[PDB]
Amino acid sequence: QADLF
Amino acid sequence: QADLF
Amino acid sequence: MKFTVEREHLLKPLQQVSTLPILGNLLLQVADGTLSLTGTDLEMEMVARVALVQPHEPGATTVPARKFFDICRGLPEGAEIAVQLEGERMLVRSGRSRFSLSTLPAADFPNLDDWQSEVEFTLPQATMKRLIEATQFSMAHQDVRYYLNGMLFETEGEELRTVATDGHRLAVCSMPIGQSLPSHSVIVPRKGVIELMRMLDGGDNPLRVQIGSNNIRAHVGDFIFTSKLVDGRFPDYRRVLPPDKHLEAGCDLLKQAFARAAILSNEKFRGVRLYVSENQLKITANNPEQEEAEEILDVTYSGAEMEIGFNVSYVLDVLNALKCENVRMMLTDSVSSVQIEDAASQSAAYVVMPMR
Amino acid sequence: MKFTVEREHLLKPLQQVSPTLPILGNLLLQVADGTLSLTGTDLEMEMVARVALVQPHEPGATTVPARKFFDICRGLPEGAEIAVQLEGERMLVRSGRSRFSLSTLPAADFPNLDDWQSEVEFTLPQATMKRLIEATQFSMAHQDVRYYLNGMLFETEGEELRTVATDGHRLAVCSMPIGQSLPSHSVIVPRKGVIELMRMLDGGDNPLRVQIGSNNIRAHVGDFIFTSKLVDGRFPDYRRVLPKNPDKHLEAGCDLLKQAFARAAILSNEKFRGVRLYVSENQLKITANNPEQEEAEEILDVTYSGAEMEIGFNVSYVLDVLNALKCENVRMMLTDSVSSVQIEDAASQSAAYVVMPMRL
């Protein structure tokens, strides 16, 4: 999973 | 509570 | 194994059939132009048969129950489901959707041993629904006395009878069926009763019942349900069916007065006080924070004045179970049981023991 | 304190106003100026209902158990007249031949939330508030250590009111025109306040009167007032994460897309929920697999004309966006495999959804 920020 | 048996 | 079936012909069977790994799988078997779907938990078994119009190949496998059901249900309305085996996996194909599920061998699936039926009778679905619904709420919840956690199914004369008790309250319902039957009594577990009911759709098809020594079988349409029976001896309920005091009141009025008094009774003990006198009933409730409720009703009563205590959950459960206009209460004294009944039917009787 | 009211006039108020400490489980009842006020609270928020008093009454106040008082009134027959009186340390309720005596706690001991000043005020239909909450609510974080992401951002800009919700991975933004020149203001309403804001709407004729302070929010509708404390914190910038110049755009029917992702979801990893999306000329291929080597594959006709691409996504996030959208067609705006996707109704720009991908 990546971050929005 | 009563208690049938 | 290979088959193609319309999603709508799979859906009711898949619903109706759904700790060790294989118990989470459905046994799928193609034979004699029919697809059999089988579920089990080791105590009970459900088997569904689907007709095969389209080309098919015989064989068998097991597949994850919820995964297979979800896929079929998730497919569009009117979809054709093509099922095939390719090694250790099951292939499901519809439209442009493809699914490959992991299997377990059909040979490893638990097969309940062949048993012998001692009693057999047919009855409408509506007769079975009434019997269960009239008594079910009275079954004990996880009591140490395991034999009270199920339901008694009794055959006598031309009647079938259901009994349920938790030692404090009792529910008895008898229905005529029109067949001379031997005197037999069995205890169906809580889980079997839920399933017996769950299989009743409410249609034309009769229910075919078979009772063995330690098993019960129910056939309806293309489904077969089997359950193990509870290995115990049910108490002498006939010894507890009482009377010099009789009360008559409207069911709704009574149900609503007990429900309001219930709010102000002890949360754990639920004790309400009943005062019966010339054409009047007075219901009173108290709790540990000294709160007090009082309800007065016009009833038909002409006997001696009396004060009797009851657990209000037990009284309300009996009244929610009676879908009628009038209720008869049959009393004797303050330390003896009350018999509650529909004033216009003797098919179901409810016996509640009081509290001091 | 004495009053007689028709049960039907008490019903909706009691239902709207209804613990850590005993008095928080009680309703504050106050008779004054020919009006009965009903007040509920949990320290963080307060709900106040006002009922007109036609019949003779006496002024005063008390507190009574909330659920016990409500259940008695609701339990009474249709068209009942409820007579309420005080007799020592107890409250007397009388209707027909029914009598109830409840235990009280003093009105003076009831918590009174401190007085505050409104900085922004606006009116809006109930339907406009229902849309804003429903379009973003599912995107709020669940018990995250960063407490601020556990609520919903209410922002006023120009003549529009906006709601924003994010968990750090996926985002929901909804803006609605209000026809009033408003100052630029941003506040975080907690989860509980959002549930209550939504709970108070009956979608009827009455407009919603909103007042926002520095640490409080007030909502008026008919004869009810709702007040909530705001979340102390600083919400992230929504603008900073809306794709810049997207080179990839896809259109597809909402239902077919929602159903294909839902079927692939069954065969994805239970904890990680990763699905693989393969986009090409007028086609979408969705694939899922799990640790037990099970596999699903869905192929759809879509309108897409850009470069071929493979992008991973958590299927719960995609489905939540699609269950949220109640429309015929959906537009997906992508850049590359390591950047976020923007999902939108193809015929409305009032709501936007931003989902960050996963590497597989």
Curated annotation (Swiss-Prot), chain C:
Induction of its expression: Part of the dnaA-dnaN-recF-gyrB operon, but also transcribed from at least 3 promoters within the upstream dnaA gene, induced at 42 degrees Celsius. Induced 1.5-fold by hydroxyurea. A shorter isoform, beta* is induced by UV treatment and also at low levels in late logarithmic/early stationary phase growth (at protein level). Beta* transcription induced by naldixic acid.
An individual GO BP term: regulation of DNA-templated DNA replication initiation
Biotechnology: Small molecules can bind to the hydrophobic cleft and inhibit binding of various protein factors, suggesting this may make and attractive antibiotic target.
Keywords of the record: Cytoplasm, DNA replication, DNA-binding, DNA-directed DNA polymerase, Nucleotidyltransferase, Transferase
Region entry 1, spans: 1-113
Keyword Ribonucleoprotein applies: no
Example of a GO cellular component annotation carried by this entry: Hda-beta clamp complex
Effect recorded for G59E: In dnaN159; a temperature- and UV-sensitive mutation, displays altered DNA polymerase usage, chronically induced SOS response
Subunit: Forms a ring-shaped head-to-tail homodimer around DNA, which can be opened by the delta subunit. Binds interacting factors in a hydrophobic surface cleft between domains 2 and 3, each monomer is able to bind different proteins simultaneously. The beta* isoform probably forms homotrimers which probably load onto DNA. The DNA polymerase III holoenzyme complex contains at least 10 different subunits organized into 3 functionally essential subassemblies: the Pol III core, the beta sliding clamp processivity factor and the clamp-loading complex.
Protein's recorded name: Beta sliding clamp
Source organism phylogeny: Bacteria, Pseudomonadati, Pseudomonadota, Gammaproteobacteria, Enterobacterales
UniProtKB/Swiss-Prot annotation, chain D:
Annotated localization: Cytoplasm
One GO MF term attached to the UniProt entry: identical protein binding
Task performed by this protein: Confers DNA tethering and processivity to DNA polymerases and other proteins. Acts as a clamp, forming a ring around DNA (a reaction catalyzed by the clamp-loading complex) which diffuses in an ATP-independent manner freely and bidirectionally along dsDNA. DNA bound in the ring is bent 22 degrees, in solution primed DNA is bound more tightly than dsDNA, suggesting the clamp binds both ss- and dsDNA. In a complex of DNA with this protein, alpha, epsilon and tau subunits however the DNA is only slightly bent.
Main subcellular localisation: cytoplasm
Region (3): 239-359
Lineage: Bacteria, Pseudomonadati, Pseudomonadota, Gammaproteobacteria, Enterobacterales
Gene Ontology terms: biological process: bacterial-type DNA replication; DNA damage response; DNA strand elongation involved in DNA replication; DNA-templated DNA replication; error-prone translesion synthesis; negative regulation of DNA-templated DNA replication initiation; regulation of DNA-templated DNA replication initiation
Alphabetized PANTHER family for the sequence: BETA SLIDING CLAMP, DNA POLYMERASE III SUBUNIT BETA
2: region residues: 123-237
Keywords tagged on the record: Cytoplasm, DNA replication, DNA-binding, DNA-directed DNA polymerase, Nucleotidyltransferase, Transferase
Binding-site residues, DNA: R67, Q143, Y147, Y148
Subunit structure: Forms a ring-shaped head-to-tail homodimer around DNA, which can be opened by the delta subunit. Binds interacting factors in a hydrophobic surface cleft between domains 2 and 3, each monomer is able to bind different proteins simultaneously. The beta* isoform probably forms homotrimers which probably load onto DNA. The DNA polymerase III holoenzyme complex contains at least 10 different subunits organized into 3 functionally essential subassemblies: the Pol III core, the beta sliding clamp processivity factor and the clamp-loading complex.
Name by which UniProt lists this protein: Beta sliding clamp
Family classification: Belongs to the beta sliding clamp family.
Organism: Escherichia coli (strain K12)
Other facts noted in the record for this chain: The temperature- and UV-sensitive allele dnaN159 does not grow at temperatures higher than 37 degrees Celsius. The global SOS response is chronically induced. The UV-sensitivity of dnaN159 is dependent upon Pol IV (dinB), it has an enhanced Pol V-dependent mutation rate (umuC, umuD), and is absolutely dependent on the polymerase activity of Pol I (polA) for viability.
Gene3D superfamilies, A to Z: DNA Polymerase III, subunit A, domain 2
Region 1: start-end pairs: 1-114
